[PDB]
Design a protein around this nucleic acid. Sequence first.
RNA 1: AUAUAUUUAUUAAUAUAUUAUCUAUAUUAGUUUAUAUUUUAAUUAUUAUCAUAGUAGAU
RNA 2: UGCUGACAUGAGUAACGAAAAAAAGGUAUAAACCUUUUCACCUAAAACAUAAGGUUUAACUAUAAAAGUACGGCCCCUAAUUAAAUUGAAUAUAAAUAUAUUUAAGAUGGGAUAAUCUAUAUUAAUAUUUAUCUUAAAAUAUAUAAUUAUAUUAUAUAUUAUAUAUUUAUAUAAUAUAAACUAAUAAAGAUCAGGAAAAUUAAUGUAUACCGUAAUGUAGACCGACUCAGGUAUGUAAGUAGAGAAUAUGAAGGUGAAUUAGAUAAUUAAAGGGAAGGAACUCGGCAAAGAUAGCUCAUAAGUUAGUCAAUAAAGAGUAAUAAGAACAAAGUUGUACAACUGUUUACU
Lengths: 57, 217, 157, 46, 49, 112, 146
Amino acid sequence: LTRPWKKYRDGELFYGLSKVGNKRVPLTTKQGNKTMYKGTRASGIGRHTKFGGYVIN
Amino acid sequence: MKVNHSISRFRPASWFEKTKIIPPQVYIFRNLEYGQVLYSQFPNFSQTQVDKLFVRPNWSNRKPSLRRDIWKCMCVVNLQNYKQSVHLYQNLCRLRYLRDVAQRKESDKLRKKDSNGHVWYSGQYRPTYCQEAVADLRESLLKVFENATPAEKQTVPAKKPSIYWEDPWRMGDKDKHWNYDVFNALGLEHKLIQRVGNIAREESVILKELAKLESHP
Amino acid sequence: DINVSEKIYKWTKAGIEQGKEHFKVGGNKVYFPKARIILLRPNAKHTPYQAKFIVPKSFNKLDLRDYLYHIYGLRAMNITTQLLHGKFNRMNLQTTRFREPQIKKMTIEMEEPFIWPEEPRPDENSFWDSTTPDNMEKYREERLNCLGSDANKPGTA
Amino acid sequence: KSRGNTYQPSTLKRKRTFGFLARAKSKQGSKILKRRKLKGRWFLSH
Amino acid sequence: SGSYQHLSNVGSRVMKRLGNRPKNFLPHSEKFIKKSTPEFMKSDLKEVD
Amino acid sequence: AVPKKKVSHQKKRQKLYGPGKKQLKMIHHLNKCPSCGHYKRANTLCMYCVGQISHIWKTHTAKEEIKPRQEEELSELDQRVLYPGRRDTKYTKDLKDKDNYLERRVRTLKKD
Amino acid sequence: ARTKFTKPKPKQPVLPKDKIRPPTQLTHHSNNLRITEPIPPTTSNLRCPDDHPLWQFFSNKKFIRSADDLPPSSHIRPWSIPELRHKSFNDLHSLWYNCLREQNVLARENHLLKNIVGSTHDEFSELSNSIRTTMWQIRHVLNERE
RNA sequence: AUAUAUUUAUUAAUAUAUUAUCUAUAUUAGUUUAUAUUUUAAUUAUUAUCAUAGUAGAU
RNA sequence: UGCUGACAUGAGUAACGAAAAAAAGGUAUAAACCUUUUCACCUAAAACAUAAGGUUUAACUAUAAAAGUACGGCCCCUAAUUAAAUUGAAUAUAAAUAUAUUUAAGAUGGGAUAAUCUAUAUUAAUAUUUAUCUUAAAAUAUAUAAUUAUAUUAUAUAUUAUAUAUUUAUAUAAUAUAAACUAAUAAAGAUCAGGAAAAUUAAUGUAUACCGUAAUGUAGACCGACUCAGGUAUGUAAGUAGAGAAUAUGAAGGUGAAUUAGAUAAUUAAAGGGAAGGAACUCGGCAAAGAUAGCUCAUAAGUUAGUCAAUAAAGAGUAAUAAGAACAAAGUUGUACAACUGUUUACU
Ligand SMILES: [Mg+2]
Ligand SMILES: [Mg+2]
Ligand SMILES: [Mg+2]
Ligand SMILES: [Mg+2]
Ligand SMILES: [Mg+2]
Ligand SMILES: [Mg+2]
Ligand SMILES: [Mg+2]
Ligand SMILES: [Mg+2]
Ligand SMILES: [Mg+2]
Ligand SMILES: [Mg+2]
Ligand SMILES: [Mg+2]
Ligand SMILES: [Mg+2]
Ligand SMILES: [Mg+2]
Ligand SMILES: [Mg+2]
Ligand SMILES: [Mg+2]
Ligand SMILES: [Mg+2]
Ligand SMILES: [Mg+2]
Ligand SMILES: [Mg+2]
Ligand SMILES: [Mg+2]
Ligand SMILES: [Mg+2]
Ligand SMILES: [Mg+2]
Ligand SMILES: [Mg+2]
Ligand SMILES: [Mg+2]
Ligand SMILES: [Mg+2]
Ligand SMILES: [Mg+2]
Ligand SMILES: [Mg+2]
Ligand SMILES: [Mg+2]
Ligand SMILES: [Mg+2]
Ligand SMILES: [Mg+2]
Ligand SMILES: [Mg+2]
Ligand SMILES: [Mg+2]
Ligand SMILES: [Mg+2]
Ligand SMILES: [Mg+2]
Ligand SMILES: [Mg+2]
């Protein structure tokens, strides 16, 4: 019994309110494949190096 | 190929004197996510030490990850001899084993329990582990010194053992703890780690610079 | 002669000794910034020598160091960023779902420890009194869920 | 074998073949983008 | 009531729609607010935009 | 294996409320508690009298709470800086409100 | 598989006592080592200064300003565009950052109120908005001047 | 080893109770085992669980 | 078999979805939540780390901490491939557009430094898959520099004692268990003949950007209408025993479930045993039962010469002579069709 105050089935979900809804919301940083990179307009300084680093300008 | 490094094995006193990589001292690290503590014989630590220290991991004392971004050095203890340093390291590890496996029942009742009977946590951080490390270090140090105490000048006045915390807050009160006569006999001094540069970012340079100062000769 | 990391340490030590920036000042000068940062109460995993802030999302780690030093005089040695997620939320099941705002938080290690002030007792600060808002919400939910004969049932609000 | 699990999610494919740029960068894609806009749809694309 | 909403403006379209309800259907919401408030902060006068 | 016609009000009622077995029976086996003095079921024990004795056992054979020496020596300030307050979730908050889904037994009526 | 016909495997070889290398360690931990109660860290060891810069994030070293302490709305009024025109760049610069500093303080109080108490008093929000008005009025004056 | 009574002189011993039969280094990188090294890290007796009711013979 | 809304009958009936639980206390509020003890299940997983996915569901608003040295993305480079892009007049075509060349994008791939911790920038000059076989020699046991048999064929770092620039490094010599297993050159068998792309010095320089980080991830946290016995990628996966990741237990960990408590009628499903017969059953030995080694020997006819037949059937050696875990292991022959290994009607 996940919720001791709900002994019988009342339609309540395991978590949240609805299992369905819109999926066309804009992407964010925390979600996507490991190769995704959203960014936060917080770095326009320097130049990526050829090896894969950074150089602050 | 030299697969084995200075930190792969457990280095005894004879190895330290021949190599003289660092002055006799033991580093104590803390984890900033789970709140756990790791004892190291060198400024650097790897997966082998973690495995040898967390042998009985459960949902409370989870095995930490070797992600350097969440490990920070808490206290660097310097000792007069290499035998003392090795002996302290062994004592600290024994308590961790006793506290985790052999005498877990008696350790548990000393810990702080919140409602629901679990060990206090704010997330996965449990301060009881850091406090335990400080207490164990104090007890191990006391048992380290009591075995050997010349009480005289054998060949040369030995260097006074010292201790290097990040901040004075971490250690308890200077009166009800860390005030036994034995420590005052050897003149244990509570000193603070140099705090100017980026500590975590530049810990390696700090530890060496403190290592050179410790080796006054 | 010396490693890069040693040189970085020397520069920071030199800056503190001379009463000047312990970092490198960039060339893009902002004369009238509008960024605001919120101090946050310490967590258990913190120490009295740190402080956590809710910085703007478009805020570099270097930006906060300059922001603190030049406006407040506080020098942050190590700064580290924790960017949070936004959970889906909806005021009612009939409306479209959208994510909660992402909040960027950074933690700074300082040289002089800080301890927050004591929180007011519920008898002096009118604002800091959680009974009234929670009580209203309990009344709000109770009267929205009372469907039939429960109208006459006494309320706990 | 059992069916019903035809939709196996993947953000890369879902965005690459149904995303906004996946349609804004083609004649046919743009046409359906503007058709949805004219109908007044809130969510033009993925 | 921790929501972090005051620090940002997310859902501009939905917020505008909710806050710009049609004037014909205000009585729908007026009943909701009235029935869901204590009597000692409610007045019997209509509100003003 | 399916009803061929809708069952009328008459047939439904006499099927459920007709027979004596389907209808519940008067409780005639009630006695007076020798100790409580109130009503109780025959050949059973008075729950209140049993409950209070169990209470006596609990308070006289309770194990002292483990209160570690370390904690009681901390000032309020150190407790705050070391054990800050934390917020609870909806599930956790509801669970603490145990008076909404747990309720105690009702004291039986007195028999004269 | 372990059938009934299986025979025990031969014992492993053992190095003779005359050739076994002595271990590099002979002494070990102490067997009289007892578990002590944890020792909490204490703030009595600290010296948190009274001039600490973070104090600028609080109003007179107070957790959250009450109604009386907050400046009343009647007694106050944001700057006016003509008034800012009589100010030097340095003074306008000084005003901007003073506005920003209190904006940080008010933001800290709003967040604490709206994230813990949940009250909708928004007295701090209105004060911040009034400061925000002055801030853009400063920006307008500078542009018009340039 | 700790605690309580007795003897002896806070050490040692008897009685009782509780607890434990661990751990750590070396044998060329990792794991397991074996031996040596450090510590106090025991042998018996009678039970118990799992393997289709583990399985066979009885009942 | 009209559309929509409300309410009936079936009916308080079927069902509550692989399952081990019990007492005491939180709490004179508990089968369902928390703690302690007992019992049990999973344990080459129902454990521990991860990838993708997702209404953040997490130990939660005071919340998931990175210069790099096993930390990934980001960045350099490209494969398959893509492109309202580039080329009096590139070519073609009712429009849409297609074709060829360039350029750009595109990981599922490649990218020096590093615990004696390391330094990526600016300027100037010039590798498919696959095995470690045989001889040799050292060393060892019985025998007499000859012979039989035997572990080893190459590296992985500690100690002792010596020589070099001078207690830092190298070199030398001697000592140091077995079974698995790891990355690197070595050596070499077959044809099915085994990716693309992006320099060194000399000087100067480094104040270390942004994003990922919670928990679930063989599932109550993803795809399956469901807190659905279905589908879902990777590495460890204690010991004892074994050829083995089979099978048996289970150290540690996790776990014992939105259904409970009694008798277990007729009957149903999944299992155990069964006298005397032993296929009489049945369309039809369907189902069920049947294993006298699992190691070492031995092993016929036919035959395309291939221990194909063949793991040949029966048989032998090893304690078993009444039996006592689990797993592997289930006969012979004739005929029709097809050479054989394979593919096919997702769901008869
Ligand atoms: Mg993801
Ligand atoms: Mg670092
Ligand atoms: Mg980060
Ligand atoms: Mg579907
Ligand atoms: Mg496709
Ligand atoms: Mg089992
Ligand atoms: Mg009709
Ligand atoms: Mg019926
Ligand atoms: Mg029935
Ligand atoms: Mg039923
Ligand atoms: Mg109870
Ligand atoms: Mg198996
Ligand atoms: Mg095993
Ligand atoms: Mg897991
Ligand atoms: Mg490219
Ligand atoms: Mg890749
Ligand atoms: Mg994760
Ligand atoms: Mg994790
Ligand atoms: Mg499932
Ligand atoms: Mg789903
Ligand atoms: Mg177990
Ligand atoms: Mg689990
Ligand atoms: Mg169930
Ligand atoms: Mg029979
Ligand atoms: Mg028979
Ligand atoms: Mg027949
Ligand atoms: Mg017949
Ligand atoms: Mg059959
Ligand atoms: Mg033949
Ligand atoms: Mg079989
Ligand atoms: Mg024929
Ligand atoms: Mg065929
Ligand atoms: Mg076939
Ligand atoms: Mg078929």
